[PDB]
């Protein structure tokens, strides 16, 4: 949409990747 409402920028995407890691780190330990 707009850049200035998306602020800013790369630590928000990185804090999206850590639950993407997390949804495998949380589901592996259930299987262990």
């Amino acid at each position: 949409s707009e850049s200035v409402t998306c602020q800013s920028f790369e630590l928000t995407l990185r804090s999206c990747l850590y639950p993407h890691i997390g949804k495998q780190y949380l589901e592996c330990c259930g299987n262990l």
Binding site: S1, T5, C6, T12, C16, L17
Partner: peptide, 16 residues
């Protein structure tokens, strides 16, 4: 799921 995590990051960029 390599670019899939980055595709959801770009999808979150358009929804932020």
């Amino acid at each position: 799921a390599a670019a899939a995590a980055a595709a959801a990051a770009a999808a979150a960029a358009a929804a932020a």
